[PDB]
Amino acid sequence: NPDTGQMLGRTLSRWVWISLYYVAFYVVMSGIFALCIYVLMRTIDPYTPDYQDQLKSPGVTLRPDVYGEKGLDISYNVSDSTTWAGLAHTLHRFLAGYSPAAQEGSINCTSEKYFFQESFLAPNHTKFSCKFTADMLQNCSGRPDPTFGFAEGKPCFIIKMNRIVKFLPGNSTAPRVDCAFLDQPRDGPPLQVEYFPANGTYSLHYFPYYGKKAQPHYSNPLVAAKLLNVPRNRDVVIVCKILAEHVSFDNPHDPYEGKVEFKLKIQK
Amino acid sequence: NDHQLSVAELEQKYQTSATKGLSASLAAELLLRDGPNALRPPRGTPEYVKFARQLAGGLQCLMWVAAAICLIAFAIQASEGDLTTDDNLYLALALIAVVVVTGCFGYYQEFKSTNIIASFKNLVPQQATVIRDGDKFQINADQLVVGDLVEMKGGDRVPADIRILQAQGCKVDNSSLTGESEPQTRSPECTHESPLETRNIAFFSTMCLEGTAQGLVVNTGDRTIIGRIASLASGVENEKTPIAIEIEHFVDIIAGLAILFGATFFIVAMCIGYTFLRAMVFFMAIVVAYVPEGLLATVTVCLSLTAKRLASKNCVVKNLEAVETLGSTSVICSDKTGTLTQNRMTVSHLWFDNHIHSADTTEDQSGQTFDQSSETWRALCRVLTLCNRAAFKSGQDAVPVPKRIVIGDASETALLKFSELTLGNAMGYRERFPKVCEIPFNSTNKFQLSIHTLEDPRDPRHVLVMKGAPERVLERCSSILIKGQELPLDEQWREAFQTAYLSLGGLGERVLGFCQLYLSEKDYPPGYAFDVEAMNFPTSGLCFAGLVSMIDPPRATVPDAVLKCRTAGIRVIMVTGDHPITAKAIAASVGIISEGSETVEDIAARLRVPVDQVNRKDARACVINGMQLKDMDPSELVEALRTHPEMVFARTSPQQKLVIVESCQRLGAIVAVTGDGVNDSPALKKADIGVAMGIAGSDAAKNAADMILLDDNFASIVTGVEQGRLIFDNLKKSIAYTLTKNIPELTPYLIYITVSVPLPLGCITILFIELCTDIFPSVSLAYEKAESDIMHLRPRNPKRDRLVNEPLAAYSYFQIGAIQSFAGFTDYFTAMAQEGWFPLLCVGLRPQWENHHLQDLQDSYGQEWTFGQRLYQQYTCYTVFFISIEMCQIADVLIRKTRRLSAFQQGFFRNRILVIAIVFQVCIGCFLCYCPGMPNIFNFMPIRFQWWLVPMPFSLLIFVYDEIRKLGVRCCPGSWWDQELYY
Numbered sequence A: 001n002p003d004t005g006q007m008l009g010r011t012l013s014r015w016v017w018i019s020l021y022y023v024a025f026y027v028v029m030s031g032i033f034a035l036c037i038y039v040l041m042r043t044i045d046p047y048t049p050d051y052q053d054q055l056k057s058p059g060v061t062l063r064p065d066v067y068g069e070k071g072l073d074i075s076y077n078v079s080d081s082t083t084w085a086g087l088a089h090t091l092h093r094f095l096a097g098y099s100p101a102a103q104e105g106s107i108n109c110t111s112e113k114y115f116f117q118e119s120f121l122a123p124n125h126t127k128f129s130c131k132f133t134a135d136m137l138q139n140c141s142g143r144p145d146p147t148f149g150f151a152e153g154k155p156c157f158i159i160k161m162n163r164i165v166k167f168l169p170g171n172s173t174a175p176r177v178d179c180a181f182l183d184q185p186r187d188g189p190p191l192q193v194e195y196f197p198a199n200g201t202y203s204l205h206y207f208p209y210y211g212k213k214a215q216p217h218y219s220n221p222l223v224a225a226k227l228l229n230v231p232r233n234r235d236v237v238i239v240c241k242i243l244a245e246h247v248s249f250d251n252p253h254d255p256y257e258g259k260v261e262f263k264l265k266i267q268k
Numbered sequence B: 001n002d003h004q005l006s007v008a009e010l011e012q013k014y015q016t017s018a019t020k021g022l023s024a025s026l027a028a029e030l031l032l033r034d035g036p037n038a039l040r041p042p043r044g045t046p047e048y049v050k051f052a053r054q055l056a057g058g059l060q061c062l063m064w065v066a067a068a069i070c071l072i073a074f075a076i077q078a079s080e081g082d083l084t085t086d087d088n089l090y091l092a093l094a095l096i097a098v099v100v101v102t103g104c105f106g107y108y109q110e111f112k113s114t115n116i117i118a119s120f121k122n123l124v125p126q127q128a129t130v131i132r133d134g135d136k137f138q139i140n141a142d143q144l145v146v147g148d149l150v151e152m153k154g155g156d157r158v159p160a161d162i163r164i165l166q167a168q169g170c171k172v173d174n175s176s177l178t179g180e181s182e183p184q185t186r187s188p189e190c191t192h193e194s195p196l197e198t199r200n201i202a203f204f205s206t207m208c209l210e211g212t213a214q215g216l217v218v219n220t221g222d223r224t225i226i227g228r229i230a231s232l233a234s235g236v237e238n239e240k241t242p243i244a245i246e247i248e249h250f251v252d253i254i255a256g257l258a259i260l261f262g263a264t265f266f267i268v269a270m271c272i273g274y275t276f277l278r279a280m281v282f283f284m285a286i287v288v289a290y291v292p293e294g295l296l297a298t299v300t301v302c303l304s305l306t307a308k309r310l311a312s313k314n315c316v317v318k319n320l321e322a323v324e325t326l327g328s329t330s331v332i333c334s335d336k337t338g339t340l341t342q343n344r345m346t347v348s349h350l351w352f353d354n355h356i357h358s359a360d361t362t363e364d365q366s367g368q369t370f371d372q373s374s375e376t377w378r379a380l381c382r383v384l385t386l387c388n389r390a391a392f393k394s395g396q397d398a399v400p401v402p403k404r405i406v407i408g409d410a411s412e413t414a415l416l417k418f419s420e421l422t423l424g425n426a427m428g429y430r431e432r433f434p435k436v437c438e439i440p441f442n443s444t445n446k447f448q449l450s451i452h453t454l455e456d457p458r459d460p461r462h463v464l465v466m467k468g469a470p471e472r473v474l475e476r477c478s479s480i481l482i483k484g485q486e487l488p489l490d491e492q493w494r495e496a497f498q499t500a501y502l503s504l505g506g507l508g509e510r511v512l513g514f515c516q517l518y519l520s521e522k523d524y525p526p527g528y529a530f531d532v533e534a535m536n537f538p539t540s541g542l543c544f545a546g547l548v549s550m551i552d553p554p555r556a557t558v559p560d561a562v563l564k565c566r567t568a569g570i571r572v573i574m575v576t577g578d579h580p581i582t583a584k585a586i587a588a589s590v591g592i593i594s595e596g597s598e599t600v601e602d603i604a605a606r607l608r609v610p611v612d613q614v615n616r617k618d619a620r621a622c623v624i625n626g627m628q629l630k631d632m633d634p635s636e637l638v639e640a641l642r643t644h645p646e647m648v649f650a651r652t653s654p655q656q657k658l659v660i661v662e663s664c665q666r667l668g669a670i671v672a673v674t675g676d677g678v679n680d681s682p683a684l685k686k687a688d689i690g691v692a693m694g695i696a697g698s699d700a701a702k703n704a705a706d707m708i709l710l711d712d713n714f715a716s717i718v719t720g721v722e723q724g725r726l727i728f729d730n731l732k733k734s735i736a737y738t739l740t741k742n743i744p745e746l747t748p749y750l751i752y753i754t755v756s757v758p759l760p761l762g763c764i765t766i767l768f769i770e771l772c773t774d775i776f777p778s779v780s781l782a783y784e785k786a787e788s789d790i791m792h793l794r795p796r797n798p799k800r801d802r803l804v805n806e807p808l809a810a811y812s813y814f815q816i817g818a819i820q821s822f823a824g825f826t827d828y829f830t831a832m833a834q835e836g837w838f839p840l841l842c843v844g845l846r847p848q849w850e851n852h853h854l855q856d857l858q859d860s861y862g863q864e865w866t867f868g869q870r871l872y873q874q875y876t877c878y879t880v881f882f883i884s885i886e887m888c889q890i891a892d893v894l895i896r897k898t899r900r901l902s903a904f905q906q907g908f909f910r911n912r913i914l915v916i917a918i919v920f921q922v923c924i925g926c927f928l929c930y931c932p933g934m935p936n937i938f939n940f941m942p943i944r945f946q947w948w949l950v951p952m953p954f955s956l957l958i959f960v961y962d963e964i965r966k967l968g969v970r971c972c973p974g975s976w977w978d979q980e981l982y983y
């Protein structure tokens, strides 16, 4: 079918015309698609999303986050510092963003109430965001313990709630972290936790989040859960739940919605 | 052979005797040397091999290869850290399931058709009369051995191939084995060289009609004439159907496009940093993507619907592919006796009152009648009614006269039926005219005589009525009856009678002469002693009533069916074993030879010149007999076929019918064969489609044929031609509709691989589109009406007009499919942007998006998402892409209704099935989107109403673009636009 005069059943002039027609067709279609995308992006609001259909309840993440086969798995040896050196380094890297120099774009907040802002009073047409420094975690801030309690077998875990634009957890009381054994071992007592800040609360003045354009310096408030009575040389499962009026943790299809669960083994 | 070989030289080969026969021990030993005198059954085809055949096929094999490639890809992705590979298993299972269920459907169709055809198949044990060592006992037919002495009488079946030694008025029915419509005399003398033409050979499967005969068995079982025809049919190979060829061509197009696309994106994946295994997996993914899973089901359903429509007209196909062949047929080779004609002798013409009249020969009496108001007609009718001995079987009031069963020979049966149709109550009239003397028909005088008395009590004469050969009657009959007169023979009546006789003879009709005489009451008083041996009555000086001629006439619908076939551009050739004169007369009667068409012999007779000095190119018609065909080489046969458009083959053997079919097929034509007898079975098998008469058809013919006309209605051929052309066009439309949606199902995967956006469309939703939502709309296009006078078009050129061609493929894939892809991606980006993911952030996001270890990934607003939330957003993207495809497919099915006409011209809602299919598609889409549990069962999401509206302008654009394209084709008939944009 290839030839000299008619290549694949078409003269060279005919190929030119049909190819030009297809080029014009695809140019017109691409222009229509580009116009549709431009119109969409001009209808989009730059501060608030149109819908939050998949964001009814915030996710919960934990640091240090080491994943095994299915989910978070943290195992180390109190005798061997090499086992928890990486975990401590991860925590230090994470708290570098909560250093006071990193918190320069935020302000001190003391209201302990929803920080509602209807105007852009902060510099460069921005809304204010509240400060959160590592020192509010105290014993789990990395000072005076750079190992975050891992050397002594009382590790610190930092719990963070996923931020959602204009989400309100509930203002009767501050949202609070509660960590417990998923299945309490019958050879020991229930889990004993000391929280930082005290009682493991996220202050209400960190809410609502107004988005990245309105609050470029926003920082998620943190809660540190220092586990005090983890049995040695045994595999335990720990679940840290968020207790708030508008936060649900009962989703069979999202094990990170409103809570975080991890496996922990501390060897000696 | 044995026929040109005297009884002296016989009885030595066969070690028999004409008087005694064979010894019992010799017969029993020959019965052990050879087998029983029976035909071998057509052997084979176990019930699972048919199912395996249904599982085989071009589209089926493409799907088998696609499933195997899916399995290989699953194995390769399990041999590494790819995983998440349930999609390959789902798709392979879907492919295999579609193939298997479609094969089950096809097998059921063939099984049901086989049962329908066998429901009209009977079975009977056959016995024979044999004379061995002087004892004339009865015996089973298959007990016979070669050289046996056999006796047969009227009404029996001939028990084997027999060389006649004695015969007394023996006639046989050879219409099934040969093409001979008229009963054939069997005599104990050699009359022709060939055994098929001599009078001293009677054949195995035929029926003795009247008289008695004695003969020697010369062939037995599979070595008889019918056994050799069955052997010849067994050696004929059945070719692929035209629709199978078209499907294979379309599969080749699909495979080539898949290979090109997959290779190009394999290279792209290599160049953008993928590994060899990853790129190979992508290439095989694309190749499998180009295979449409539901198209096999759509095609099978459309063919079954056409088959059901044909069966509504008593036309039963043995396989679904046969419903298309008549649409593509360009040559019909038709048998004459029993197929074009009724295979029944009936009164056709009469000669009385110096005029030639025409009678109604149709089996339903729907034709025109002659003038039945004349004293000459009354006398002729009385003569032909009284000089008859046939009788209708008792209790035949419901069955019409042409189909009533009669105890008598063919000529007397035809005369009796003609009497019943014209006068009415022929037997009542006969018994009202009592008979007092009768000389039956015999060869010494070659006529039949009878004497009757008048009905009225006031008339003492005795009426003489005579029937016989026209010349024997004319040697008598000093007078003639013309319009209430008794004109003496003035030699002008003699020349007129001779002219009429040769005219009716040249029309290929058997002619009989009728006459009467009124005996005086004085010379022949009442109660007269009429003595058959004294010959006292006058057998001369009679009065001639008229001539009556008979022919085996065409079936009623045949002439109009032939005219319609030739209007549709189909060439009709007659291939018959009958005699050339009868064949030519019937061909003229049915329209195979047109009015004014002439053969070289006709031209020579008109121009008073020898035939060798006649230009062949001036003869539109041609009649070739078997002896001339034997001497012809294939080049001469091709030359004759191309020279003469109106062709008749007469005295044609089954092998020569096969040769003619093969020559026509070699010239490039799709050939249909219509036949009924055993002599047609090899040609029927060789034909691209074989059509057999349901009622007249022999078992060999019905087994060889692809299509059976259960009511013997020849107009079903015209119905089949129209339905085949319609199904060809509608399959074109349905295939275009099905192919269009493959591009919007593939492009999201290509964008996913190359740009790394989150997956816009899933395997499960693709399966739902292919197998659930679109199959009913695709099938509904089989109910579209023709866009033109489809019966006035020529047959399509098989090598040029393909079912699926380059314009159809290009249009469907890369214009409409491209628009659908753009609609889907517009909806995808709208759904992402309105939920927080801007288009530029979507680019390259796939690794983070699919990372199970990232549970706080940030969107365009800084919100942090878990993996499960991102997965539900991905399911929303699946759903919006699915709905975009569905909305565009509504417009696609609307624009697919016509290829040239406007939707406004053809009618938006004339196809109620299509309207229902659209409503049903929308309902299933809504159910999938909004039934609870769908997100976790099939990953469909309850999408917002504005995602439904986003693709609607794209669907409207599809409709408007197709409407403008088809207006360009109608306004500019042969422009560049018609050449490139029409399909």
Ligand SMILES: CCCCCCCC/C=C\CCCCCCCC(=O)OC[C@H](COP(=O)(O)OCC[N+](C)(C)C)OC(=O)CCCCCCC/C=C/CCCCCCCC
Pocket: A026, A030, A033, A034, A035, A037, A038, A041, A042, A044, A045, A046, B747, B751, B755, B817, B818, B819, B821, B822, B825, B838, B839, B840, B843
């Ligand atoms: C054989 C020929 C094939 C041709 C295929 C199509 C070619 C063209 C495709 C892409 C080129 C660009 C098209 C888009 C043009 C966008 C028009 C525009 O001006 O928009 C502006 C946006 C940026 O606005 P912003 O977000 O900053 O505004 C924020 C507003 N505030 C601040 C208020 C929130 O720019 C953008 O989004 C740009 C986003 C473009 C990239 C999207 C991902 C690419 C995916 C393409 C798949 C298409 C497949 C088509 C089907 C093929 C069938 C064969």
Ligand SMILES: CCCCCCCC/C=C\CCCCCCCC(=O)OC[C@H](COP(=O)(O)OCC[N+](C)(C)C)OC(=O)CCCCCCC/C=C\CCCCCCCC
Pocket: B872, B923, B924, B927, B931, B932, B933, B934, B935, B936, B937
């Ligand atoms: C074209 C018309 C076809 C009609 C076919 C016959 C009708 C069958 C349809 C429905 C009958 C059963 C209806 C369901 C039972 C009553 C409703 C109910 O009790 O709801 C309870 C929950 C609601 O779930 P949700 O709204 O929270 O969803 C999850 C949302 N997410 C994304 C947010 C987390 O249900 C669950 O939890 C999951 C419970 C199991 C899922 C529902 C059971 C029925 C679904 C599938 C059965 C087979 C259907 C497929 C057949 C082949 C394909 C056509």
Ligand SMILES: CCCCCCCC/C=C\CCCCCCCC(=O)O[C@H](COC(=O)CCCCCCC/C=C/CCCCCCCC)COP(=O)(O)OCC[N+](C)(C)C
Pocket: A053, A054, B872, B890, B918, B919, B922, B923, B926, B930, B941, B942, B943, B944, B945, B946, B948
């Ligand atoms: C051709 C003949 C058609 C006859 C009618 C077809 C069947 C209609 C029957 C039922 C559909 C309506 C009821 C279910 C929807 C509400 C359930 C719900 O709740 O939807 C909710 C909102 O609903 C809506 O925005 C509107 C719903 C209806 C939209 C349009 C429906 C389709 C209509 C098509 C007509 C097209 C006609 C033109 C083309 C065809 C021409 C012939 C969705 O939930 P969400 O996104 O807030 O959840 C977010 C949380 N997440 C995602 C995790 C679960």
Ligand SMILES: CC(C)CCC[C@@H](C)[C@H]1CC[C@H]2[C@@H]3CC=C4C[C@@H](O)CC[C@]4(C)[C@H]3CC[C@]12C
Pocket: A016, A017, A018, A020, A021, A023, A024, A027, B976
């Ligand atoms: C630059 C982009 C938009 C494409 C180029 C412009 C398009 C819309 C126009 C400009 C020139 C046009 C071509 C001019 C000549 C011919 C020859 C004719 O026999 C077929 C149409 C065809 C092939 C036209 C197709 C459409 C065309 C290519």
Ligand SMILES: CC(C)CCC[C@@H](C)[C@H]1CC[C@H]2[C@@H]3CC=C4C[C@@H](O)CC[C@]4(C)[C@H]3CC[C@]12C
Pocket: A018, A019, A020, A022, A023, A026, B806, B807, B810, B814
């Ligand atoms: C749209 C993008 C992919 C075009 C990229 C350039 C190449 C691949 C394009 C440019 C012009 C095109 C051709 C234009 C016209 C025809 C004639 C048609 O009967 C077969 C395909 C065919 C449709 C196209 C094949 C692909 C093609 C050669």
Ligand SMILES: CNCC#CCOCc1cc(Cl)ccc1-c1ccc(Cl)cc1
Pocket: B069, B070, B071, B073, B074, B087, B088, B091, B281, B284, B285, B286, B288, B289, B290, B741, B742, B743, B745, B746, B749, B750, B761, B762, B763, B766
């Ligand atoms: C009409 N075309 C449809 C399509 C497509 C493109 O890739 C196929 C595809 C898509 C998706 Cl989402 C998931 C898996 C596959 C897929 C991958 C490998 C094989 Cl061997 C077969 C199929």
Ligand SMILES: *[C@@H]1O[C@H](CO)[C@@H](O)[C@H](O)[C@H]1NC(C)=O
Pocket: A139, A194, A226
């Ligand atoms: C926390 O720190 C204070 C002083 O720095 C100390 O008294 C207290 O014991 C610490 N708690 C734990 C659990 O180490």
Ligand SMILES: *[C@@H]1O[C@H](CO)[C@@H](O)[C@H](O)[C@H]1NC(C)=O
Pocket: A077, A079, A080, A233, A267, A268
């Ligand atoms: C690690 O823990 C195990 C307890 O299972 C202990 O036996 C071992 O000594 C520890 N490693 C080192 C380096 O001590």
Ligand SMILES: [Mg+2]
Pocket: B175, B176, B178, B179, B335, B336, B337, B338, B339, B675, B676, B677
């Ligand atoms: Mg016949």
